[PDB]
Amino acid sequence: PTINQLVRKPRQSKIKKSDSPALNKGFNSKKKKFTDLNSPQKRGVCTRVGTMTPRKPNSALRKYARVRLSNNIEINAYIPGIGHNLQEHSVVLVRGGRVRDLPGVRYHIVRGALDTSGVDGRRQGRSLYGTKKPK
Amino acid sequence: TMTDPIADMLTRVRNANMVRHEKLELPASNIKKEIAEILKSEGFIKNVEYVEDDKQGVLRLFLKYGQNDERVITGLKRISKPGLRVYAKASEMPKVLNGLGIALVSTSEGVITDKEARKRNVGGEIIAYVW
RNA sequence: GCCGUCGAAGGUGGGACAAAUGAUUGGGGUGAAGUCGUAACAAGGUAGCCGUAUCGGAAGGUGCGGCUGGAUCACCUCCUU
RNA sequence: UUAGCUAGUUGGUAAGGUAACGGCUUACCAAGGCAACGAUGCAUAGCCGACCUGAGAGGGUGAUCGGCCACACUGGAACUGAGACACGGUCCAGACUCCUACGGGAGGCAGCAGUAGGGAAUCUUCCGCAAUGGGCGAAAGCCUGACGGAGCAACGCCGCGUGAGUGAUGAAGGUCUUCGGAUCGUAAAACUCUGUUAUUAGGGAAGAACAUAUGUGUAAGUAACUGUGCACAUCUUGACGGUACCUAAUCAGAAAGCCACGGCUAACUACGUGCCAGCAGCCGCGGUAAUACGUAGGUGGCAAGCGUUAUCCGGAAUUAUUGGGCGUAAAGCGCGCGUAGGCGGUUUUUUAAGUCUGAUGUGAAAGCCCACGGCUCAACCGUGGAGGGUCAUUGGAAACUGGAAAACUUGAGUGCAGAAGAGGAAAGUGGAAUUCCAUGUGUAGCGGUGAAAUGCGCAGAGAUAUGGAGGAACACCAGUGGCGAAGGCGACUUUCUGGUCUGUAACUGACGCUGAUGUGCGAAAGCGUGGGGAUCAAACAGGAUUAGAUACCCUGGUAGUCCACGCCGUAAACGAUGAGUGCUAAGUGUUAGGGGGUUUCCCGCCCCUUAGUGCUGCAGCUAACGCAUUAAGCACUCCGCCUGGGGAGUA
């Protein structure tokens, strides 16, 4: 627009939003507010492990899990890899990243850091899914 | 009400390029005569001829065209326009098209082409590029 | 040492604001090949759309004013070799 | 979607008080002050040199390092002292913890560690003042969790070797094979040198170390180098650390993996599997022959690191000043009057604020960049340079912007002659059509559908003929035709009232344009108040079609459509095109004018000029369609607006 019309307003932007809406963690304890603590990953206790299916055109029994996090929030995250060593009351570390199966789940746990043990059924992607180098 | 006479003259010049007519008519001004003279001195204007009638102007100029009827410049515009006036130092003065084009600039001592303005180490308010 | 002013903390009172909560409740996004009807997309089988009003389970309808972003036909008048 | 805030506030007087000026505090007088150029509030946040990114403008951050500020369990206060209202000082109040003879008393790790708890996650409860720097002392010397140094983490950067050469037989073996062979592959084995690094023995125990006091000798002062105050000599000081590093000897022996291989993007084969398991950053793979799942081989990238995740920038021109758009894609509000603001016709003189230009001071240092030097090189460090201000002072210039003064008319406005127009308000008038009623004539029908049915009709319909009453809009005229800023304006006559153009050019001499906020007008529908209702017509009734139709269909039918005054204040309010100004090929018309020639007379004809009002079209422009003097072209100023869809005009 005209230069003076641009002087008397700060040329506002289209500020983005987050992709991990629980990248944030509220105040742990001794407080009621929710801190803006940022993290690349959060631990959490899993209160149920379940399994659901994606929408069309994919068809598969995809395995997910709802987890209570340190910030006392409720999220969902699907377990990757072959075999899952989790159940209700199991603590687990969680990463961030969305899947296109169905919404309501946009994370996925990390295999081998927490109770969730790595599966040694793999030999190619070993540095993921917790597999250790075999000999 | 006309906001800017330089805009008028440059629009007249470009609109004379798009149809190619040797003669054009435009109310003159002292800055207009000076910049027309510098245009002739670069080589873009075949001839200059001021006239007088009630009251100002009206500056009549004779355009220039190549043997194959080719327009000399490939574009022409101003930089200093109202609202956002602009200025230029001696070292910071821009080399548009280097030698190819020139940069009309008004200085404390008068309006000159881009060159002399950087030679004398005196800048000023630019008016219009041409190339 | 006594008295006087200031004085925090504390108590009392009334308001303001924020967040959780709450029986129920309203609307929305989504999911099975759910059912009902098919208004809109063509002259969509009653042209559509815009606002308002009103009716109706509902898509919607109707009335009033407007637009073409309407077609079979056809512009008063006008343009075109 | 934070609009009023402030009463010691603002100003004064007087005094007190403070190192100081000051409503800093008191008493008196006054009512001002702050705020659209964003006060106040709310929410968040220490700031900066810089760091990261980017070509650049910019964007994000405030970790080390240095500067400034604020704080020391929470709140209040003050003594000392130059300096504190005090981090390891005091008193009180408050919370916590703890001892006690129960009477009362002791502390504040956001200091170093170290410990708990929280978190995804962040470390010794180290040696020592050898150096630098602190506090004190006359000094020696003291003290100093500053700091020097050591140590832990691949946390980061950089570098580093995991051997070299010769070596084919294409060895074996693995993989694939169209069963020939090919792949790994000089790769391996082996031969010869090597030791990166390591292991041993030695040295060096290297530098950083300079010194203070101590004796010789010298200058200033005193009567007195008697003694004192000043420079040399020689004596004397290492936690790091027996380091670093170096000498000689020995071995390829201790030292390599991770991701990816469909495209993006460099790198394919077999098998398993068969919409299952799974992959997935996107496009998307897989339901029996998956180069995309898993595995094997091979290959590519990278490396003592590699991949994932989160965050930031770029890409992203996807906030567009450099560097965006608004016909149709999101984006011109409905329009009008206009404040503040932004912008500004022509010429002269003048000022020199902006601008340009030179100097001066300053922009700490470290950092970025450049150049060089030193740690074996690099990393790093040092040196020096440049660079860095929207910086202040001051010397000059005056084209341009700006200030002042003086001239002009071409913009705008006025003036004199004209032109037209459904332009607005109030009233009345004329006739038809319609409706109702009445009468005469007159019969079996009238009415309606595609077919009907409903309804009306023997109380004589309809209709015909006449006359009368009602309410409601005005037949041709009517046209792409005009007026009006849009929404609008078509009956006539008058009264009052607003606008537009042409010519004129005498006249005022820039008085202009855009224009947030504010104000008013604003379709129809809807509403308040009272009438009128002839028609027409939401809701509604009947019938008909229809599987069903409360819809379309037919017959009625209320509100409503009408008037008068208020109310509301949207619309596909459009030309999906903001207003103002200037320029750029044409032809063809239309509405209200003007100049000229042709005619005895132009009224008959033509040319030229206006302004709107259209079309076809060139240049150019556009996603294309289309725009084209009535630009969506060529530019300028100003305003409005958009930054994916749904959510949603929703809360």
Burial of B73 (0-12, 13-18, 19+ CB in 10 A): middle
- A41 to each of A38, A63, A94, A98, how far by Cα in Å? 9, 20, 6, 14
Q: For chain B, how many residues are written?
A: 131
> What is the per-residue DSSP string for A6-20?
HHTS---------S-
Tokens at A68, concatenated = 């209570």
Considering only alpha carbons, which residue of chain A is nearest residue B82?
A3
Amino acid letter, residue B114: D
> What length does chain A have?
135
Place of tokens 């987050």: A18
Angle CA A63–A66–A19, to nearest 5: 90
CA angle A32, A37, A98 (to 5 degrees): 110
Q: In which order are the strands placed within the sheet that holds B110-112?
A: B76-78, B124-130, B102-107, B110-112
B41: its two tokens? 């001195």
- Measured CA to C1', what is the nucleotide nearest B80? D400
Q: How far apart, in whole angstroms, are the C-alpha atoms of residue B107 and residue B35?
A: 13
Mark residue B26 as left, alpha or beta (left: phi above 0; alpha: psi -120 to 50; beta: remaining): beta
Q: What are phi and psi of B36, to 5 degrees?
A: -65, -40
Question: Which residues of A fall within a CB distance of 8 Å from B84?
Answer: 3
> How far is B130 from B51, CA to CA, in rounded Å?
25
Characterize the bridge pairing of strands A74-78 and A107-109: parallel
Could you tell me if B113 and B102 are in contact, meaning their C-beta atoms sit under 8 angstroms apart? yes
Cβ atoms of A94 and A44 within 8 Å: the answer is yes
Q: Using an 8 Å CB-CB cutoff, list chain A residues near B83.
A: 2-4
What span, in angstroms and rounded, lies between the C-alpha atoms of B128 and B80? 7
If you write DSSP's letter for every residue of A95-108 in order, what string do you get? EE---SS-SS--EE
The CA–C1' separation of B65 and C30, in angstroms, is 70
User: Which residues have C-beta within 8 Å of that of residue A25, sequence separation ≥ 6?
Assistant: A34, A35, A37, A38, A39, A42, A69, A70, A71
Name the one residue in this structure whose structure tokens are 């599966």: A119
Q: How many CB atoms sit inside 10 A of residue A70's CB? A: 16
Residues A135, A52: Cα–Cα separation, whole Å: 37
DSSP one-letter string for A13-45:
------S-TTSEE---SS-SS---EE-S-EEEE
Tell me how crowded residue B27 is: count the other CB atoms within 10 A of its CB: 14
CB–CB of A103/A111 below 8 Å? no
Nearest CA-CA partner of B9 in B52, B60, B69, B83:
B60
Rounded to the nearest angstrom, the minimum Cα separation between B26 and chain A is 28
On whether the CB atoms of residues A107 and A86 are closer than 8 A, the answer is no
CA B109/CA B124 separation, integer angstroms: 9
Residues of B in Cβ contact (< 8 Å) with A3:
83-84
How far does Cα A7 stand from its chain's mean position?
43
Q: Which of B96, B89, B97, B106 is nearest to B32 (CA)?
A: B106
Residue B1, token pair as written in the block: 């009400």
Contact flag, residue A13 CB and nucleic strand D, below 7 A: yes
Give the residue among A55, A53, A72, A73 at the shortest CA–CA distance from A63. A53
B8/B71 Cα distance (integer angstroms)? 20
Please tell me the distance in Å from B82's CA to the nearest CA on chain A.
10
DSSP string, B11-66: HHHHHHHTTT-SEEEE---HHHHHHHHHHHHHTS-SEEE----SSS--EEEE----
Experimental method: cryo-EM
Task: Establish how many alpha carbons lie within 13 A of residue A115's alpha carbon, considering only the half-sphere containing its beta carbon.
Answer: 14
SS (H, E, C) B38-51: HHHHHCCCCEEECC
The values of phi and psi at residue B97, to 5°, are: 65, 15
Resolution (A): 3.7
Using the CA of A103, which nucleotide's C1' is the nearest one?
A: C30
Give the pairing type, strands A107-109 and B47-49: unpaired
